Coordinates of C-alpha atoms in Angstrom, one line a residue:
Chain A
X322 CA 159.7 104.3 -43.3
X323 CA 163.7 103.8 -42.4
X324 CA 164.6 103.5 -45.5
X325 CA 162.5 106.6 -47.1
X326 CA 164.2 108.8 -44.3
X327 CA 167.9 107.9 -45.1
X328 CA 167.1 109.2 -49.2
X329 CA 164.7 111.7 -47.8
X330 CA 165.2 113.5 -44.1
X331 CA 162.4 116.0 -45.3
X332 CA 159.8 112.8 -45.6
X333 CA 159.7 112.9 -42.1
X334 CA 158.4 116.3 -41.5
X335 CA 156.1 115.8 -44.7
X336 CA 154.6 112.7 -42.9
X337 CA 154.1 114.0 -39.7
X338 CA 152.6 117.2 -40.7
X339 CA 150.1 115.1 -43.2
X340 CA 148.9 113.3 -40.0
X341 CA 148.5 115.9 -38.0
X342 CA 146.7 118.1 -40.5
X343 CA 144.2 115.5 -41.6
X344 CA 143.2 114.7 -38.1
X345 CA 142.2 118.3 -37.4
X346 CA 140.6 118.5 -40.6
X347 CA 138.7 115.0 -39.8
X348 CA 137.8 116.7 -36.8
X349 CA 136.7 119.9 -37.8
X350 CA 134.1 117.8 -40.6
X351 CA 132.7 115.9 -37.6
X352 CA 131.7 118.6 -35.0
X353 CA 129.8 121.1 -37.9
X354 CA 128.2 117.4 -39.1
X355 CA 127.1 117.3 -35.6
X356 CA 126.2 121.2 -35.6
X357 CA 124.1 120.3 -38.0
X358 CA 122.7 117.7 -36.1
X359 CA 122.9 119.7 -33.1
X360 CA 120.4 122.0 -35.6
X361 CA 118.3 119.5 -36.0
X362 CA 116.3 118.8 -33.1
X363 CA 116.7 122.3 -32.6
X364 CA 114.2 122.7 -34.9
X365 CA 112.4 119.7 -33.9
X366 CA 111.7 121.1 -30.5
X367 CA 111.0 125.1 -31.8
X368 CA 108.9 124.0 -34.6
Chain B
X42 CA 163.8 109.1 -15.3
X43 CA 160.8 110.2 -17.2
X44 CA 158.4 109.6 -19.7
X45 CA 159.2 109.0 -23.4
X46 CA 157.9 113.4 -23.9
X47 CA 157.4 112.1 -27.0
X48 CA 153.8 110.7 -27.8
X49 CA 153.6 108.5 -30.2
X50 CA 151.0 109.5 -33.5
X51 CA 152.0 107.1 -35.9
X52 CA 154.5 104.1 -35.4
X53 CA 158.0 105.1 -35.2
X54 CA 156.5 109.0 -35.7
X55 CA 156.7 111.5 -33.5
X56 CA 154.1 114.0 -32.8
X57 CA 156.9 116.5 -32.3
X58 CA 159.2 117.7 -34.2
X59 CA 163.1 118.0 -33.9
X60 CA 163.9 121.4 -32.9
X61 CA 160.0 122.0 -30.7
X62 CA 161.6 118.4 -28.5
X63 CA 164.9 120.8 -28.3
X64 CA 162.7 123.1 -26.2
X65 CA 160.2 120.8 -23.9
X66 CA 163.7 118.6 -22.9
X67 CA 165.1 122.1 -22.1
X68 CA 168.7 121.2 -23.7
X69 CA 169.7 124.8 -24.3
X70 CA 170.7 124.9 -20.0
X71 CA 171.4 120.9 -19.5
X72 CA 174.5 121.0 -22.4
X73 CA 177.8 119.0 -21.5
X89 CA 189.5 89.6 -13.4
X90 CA 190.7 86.9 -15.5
X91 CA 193.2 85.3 -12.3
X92 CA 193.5 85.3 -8.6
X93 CA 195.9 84.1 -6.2
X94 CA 195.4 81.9 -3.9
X95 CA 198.1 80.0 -1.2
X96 CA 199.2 76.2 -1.7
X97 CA 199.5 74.6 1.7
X98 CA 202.8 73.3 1.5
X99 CA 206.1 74.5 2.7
X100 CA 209.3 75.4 -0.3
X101 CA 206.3 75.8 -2.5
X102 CA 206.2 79.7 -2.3
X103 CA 202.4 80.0 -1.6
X104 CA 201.6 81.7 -4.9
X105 CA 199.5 79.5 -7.5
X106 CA 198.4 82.3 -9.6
X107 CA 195.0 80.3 -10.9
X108 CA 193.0 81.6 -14.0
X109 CA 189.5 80.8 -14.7
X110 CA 188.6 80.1 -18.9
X111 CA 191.5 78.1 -19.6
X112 CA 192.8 77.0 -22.8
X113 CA 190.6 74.0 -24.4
X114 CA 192.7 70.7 -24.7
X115 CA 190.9 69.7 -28.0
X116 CA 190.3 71.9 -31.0
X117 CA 188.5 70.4 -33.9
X118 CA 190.0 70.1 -37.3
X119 CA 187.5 72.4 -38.7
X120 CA 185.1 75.3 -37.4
X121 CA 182.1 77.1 -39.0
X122 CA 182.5 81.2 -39.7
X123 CA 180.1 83.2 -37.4
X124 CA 176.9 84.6 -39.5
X125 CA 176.6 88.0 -39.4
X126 CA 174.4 90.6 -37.8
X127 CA 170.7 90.9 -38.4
X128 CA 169.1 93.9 -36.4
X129 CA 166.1 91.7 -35.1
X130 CA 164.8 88.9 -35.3
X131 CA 163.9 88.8 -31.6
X132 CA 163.2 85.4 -29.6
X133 CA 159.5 84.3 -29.1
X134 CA 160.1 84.8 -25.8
X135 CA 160.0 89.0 -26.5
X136 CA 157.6 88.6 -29.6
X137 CA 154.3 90.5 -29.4
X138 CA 151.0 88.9 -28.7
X139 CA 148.3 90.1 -31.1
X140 CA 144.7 89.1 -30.2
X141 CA 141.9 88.9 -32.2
X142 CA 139.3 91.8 -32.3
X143 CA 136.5 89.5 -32.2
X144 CA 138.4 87.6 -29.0
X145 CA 137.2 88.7 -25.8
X146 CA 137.0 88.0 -21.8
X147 CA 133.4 85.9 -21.2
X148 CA 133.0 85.2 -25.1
X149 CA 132.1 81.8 -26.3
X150 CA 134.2 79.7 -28.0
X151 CA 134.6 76.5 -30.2
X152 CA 137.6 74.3 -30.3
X153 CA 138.8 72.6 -34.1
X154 CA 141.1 70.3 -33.9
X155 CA 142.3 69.2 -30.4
X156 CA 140.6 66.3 -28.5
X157 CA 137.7 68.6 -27.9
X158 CA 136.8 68.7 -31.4
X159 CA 133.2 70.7 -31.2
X160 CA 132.9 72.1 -28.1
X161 CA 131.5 75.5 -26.7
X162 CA 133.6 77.1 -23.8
X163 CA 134.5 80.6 -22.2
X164 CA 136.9 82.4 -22.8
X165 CA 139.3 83.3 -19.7
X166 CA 142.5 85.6 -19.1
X167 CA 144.9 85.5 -22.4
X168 CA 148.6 84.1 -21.0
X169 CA 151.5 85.8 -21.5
X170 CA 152.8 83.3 -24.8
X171 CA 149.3 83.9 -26.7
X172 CA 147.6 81.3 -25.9
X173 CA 144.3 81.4 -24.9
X174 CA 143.3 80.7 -21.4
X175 CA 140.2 79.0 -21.6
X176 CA 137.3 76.7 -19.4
X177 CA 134.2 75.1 -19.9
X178 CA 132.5 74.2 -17.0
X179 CA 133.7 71.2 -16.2
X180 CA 130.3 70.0 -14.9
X181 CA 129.0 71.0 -18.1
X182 CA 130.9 69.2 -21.4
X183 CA 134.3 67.7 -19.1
X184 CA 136.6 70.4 -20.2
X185 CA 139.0 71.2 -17.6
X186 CA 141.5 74.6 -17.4
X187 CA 143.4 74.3 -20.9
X188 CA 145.5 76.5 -23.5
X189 CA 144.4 76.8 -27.1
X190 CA 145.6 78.6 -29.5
X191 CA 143.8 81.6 -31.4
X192 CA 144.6 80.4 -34.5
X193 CA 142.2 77.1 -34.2
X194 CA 139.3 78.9 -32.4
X195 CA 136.6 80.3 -33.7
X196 CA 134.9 83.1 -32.3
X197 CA 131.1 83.1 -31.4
X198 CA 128.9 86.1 -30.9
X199 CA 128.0 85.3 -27.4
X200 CA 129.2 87.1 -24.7
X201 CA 128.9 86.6 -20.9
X202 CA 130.3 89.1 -18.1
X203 CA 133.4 88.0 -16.8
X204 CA 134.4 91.0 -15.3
X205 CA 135.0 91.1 -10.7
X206 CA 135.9 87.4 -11.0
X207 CA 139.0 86.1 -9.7
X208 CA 141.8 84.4 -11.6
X209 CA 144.5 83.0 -9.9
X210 CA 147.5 84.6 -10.2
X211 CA 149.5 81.0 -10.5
X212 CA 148.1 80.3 -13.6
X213 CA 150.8 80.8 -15.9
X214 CA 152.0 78.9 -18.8
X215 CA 154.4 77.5 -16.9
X216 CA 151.8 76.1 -14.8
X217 CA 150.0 74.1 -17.7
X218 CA 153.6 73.3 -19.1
X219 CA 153.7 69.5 -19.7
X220 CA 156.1 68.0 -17.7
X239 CA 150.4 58.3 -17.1
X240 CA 149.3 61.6 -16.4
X241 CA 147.0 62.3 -13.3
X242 CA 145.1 65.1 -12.4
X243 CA 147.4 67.0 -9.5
X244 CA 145.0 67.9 -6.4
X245 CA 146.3 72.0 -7.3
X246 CA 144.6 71.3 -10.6
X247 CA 141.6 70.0 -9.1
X248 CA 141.3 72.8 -6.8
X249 CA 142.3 75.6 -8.7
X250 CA 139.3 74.2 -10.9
X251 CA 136.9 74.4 -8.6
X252 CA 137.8 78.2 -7.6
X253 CA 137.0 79.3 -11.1
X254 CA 133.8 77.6 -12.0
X255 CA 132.1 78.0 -8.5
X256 CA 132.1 82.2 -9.7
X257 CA 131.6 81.5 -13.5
X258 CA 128.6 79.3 -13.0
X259 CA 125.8 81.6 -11.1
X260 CA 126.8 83.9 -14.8
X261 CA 125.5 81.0 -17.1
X262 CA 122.6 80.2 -14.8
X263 CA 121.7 83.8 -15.7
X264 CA 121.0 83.7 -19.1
X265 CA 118.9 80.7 -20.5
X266 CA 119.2 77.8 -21.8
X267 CA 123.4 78.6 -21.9
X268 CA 123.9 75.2 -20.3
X269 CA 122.5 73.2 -23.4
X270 CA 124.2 75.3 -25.7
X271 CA 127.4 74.7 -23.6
X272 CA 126.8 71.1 -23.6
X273 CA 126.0 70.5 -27.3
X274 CA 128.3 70.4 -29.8
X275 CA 129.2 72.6 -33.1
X276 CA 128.7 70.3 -36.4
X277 CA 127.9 70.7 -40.1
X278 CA 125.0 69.1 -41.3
X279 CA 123.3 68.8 -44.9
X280 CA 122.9 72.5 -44.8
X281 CA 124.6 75.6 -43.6
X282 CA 127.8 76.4 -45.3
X283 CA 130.5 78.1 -42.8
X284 CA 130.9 81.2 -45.2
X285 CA 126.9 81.8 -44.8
X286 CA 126.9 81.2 -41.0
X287 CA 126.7 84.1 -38.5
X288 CA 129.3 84.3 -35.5

């Protein structure tokens, strides 16, 4: 990583923001997946 | 002082960047013996023997070594980090390889501070007393007991099982009979624990270690 920054600075920022956007995007997948689920026993109990 | 502000998302990344730690730290306000003297004792002596400590070696050797050079790590073992093993933890089972205890089943107990792995069997139960293994030799069986709200001595350091006929000290003795006297009643509560305690871990005609389940 120490080595990529000295060539690149910008890596840095490119890295970080990577992270960060893939763990809002892992966590957006995993509430509607449980929505869903949330919808399913909704329907269980309705009927 | 204060906390690092800075929390930590991926090693050696921060989760904020350069100019949003500008703001949170606030910076836009908070911008800027070698001798001694002492007397003699004797008269038409003047009283001032100006003494200095590191003195010139009488002997220099007819040839030195150069100095290596700098290395930016390398830290001493003393500093290193102790990684565990996932599958390592406090009340789990486990079997010894290669010391004299070749074979037998024990519980595992606190981790010390140099990696090595605390660890008892009831000495009642297969004669192994408080002893260090290391991680590396163990392996790792699926049972777990519940080791948790017992008591450890706090004197039980690697220090303390440093090797110095040996005899068994009357502090060892003791210290033993504190642990096992609360680790007991937690075998007793499962079943038949002691005879798996007591037997030992062999190959036979059969089972092949890449097949078997621990």
């Amino acid at each position: 990583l120490r080595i990529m920054l000295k060539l690149n600075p910008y890596a840095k920022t490119m890295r970080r923001n990577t992270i960060l956007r893939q763990a809002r995007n892992h966590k957006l997948r995993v509430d509607k997946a449980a929505a869903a689920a949330a919808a399913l026993q909704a329907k269980s109990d309705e009927k | 002082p204060h906390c690092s502000r800075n929390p930590v998302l991926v090693r050696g990344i921060g989760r904020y960047s350069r100019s949003a730690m500008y703001s949170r730290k606030a910076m836009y306000k908070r911008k800027y013996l070698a001798t001694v003297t002492k007397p003699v004792g004797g008269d038409k002596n003047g009283g001032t023997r100006v003494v200095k400590l590191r003195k010139m070696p009488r002997y220099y050797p007819t040839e030195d070594v150069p100095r290596k050079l700098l290395s930016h790590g390398k830290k001493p073992f003393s500093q290193h980090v102790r990684k565990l093993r996932a599958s390592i933890t406090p009340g789990t089972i486990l079997i010894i390889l290669t010391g004299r205890h070749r074979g037998k089943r024990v519980v595992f107990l606190k981790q010390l501070a140099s990696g090595l792995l605390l660890v008892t069997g009831p000495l009642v139960l297969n004669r192994v007393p408080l002893r260090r293994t290391h991680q590396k030799f163990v392996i790792a069986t699926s049972t777990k007991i519940d080791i948790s709200n017992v008591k450890i001595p706090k004197h039980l350091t690697d220090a303390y099982f440093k090797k110095k006929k040996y005899e068994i000290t009357e502090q060892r003795k003791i210290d033993q009979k504190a642990v096992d006297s609360q680790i007991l009643p937690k075998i007793k509560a499962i079943p038949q624990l002691q005879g798996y305690l007591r037997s030992v871990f062999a190959l036979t005609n059969g089972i092949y270690p890449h097949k078997l389940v621990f």
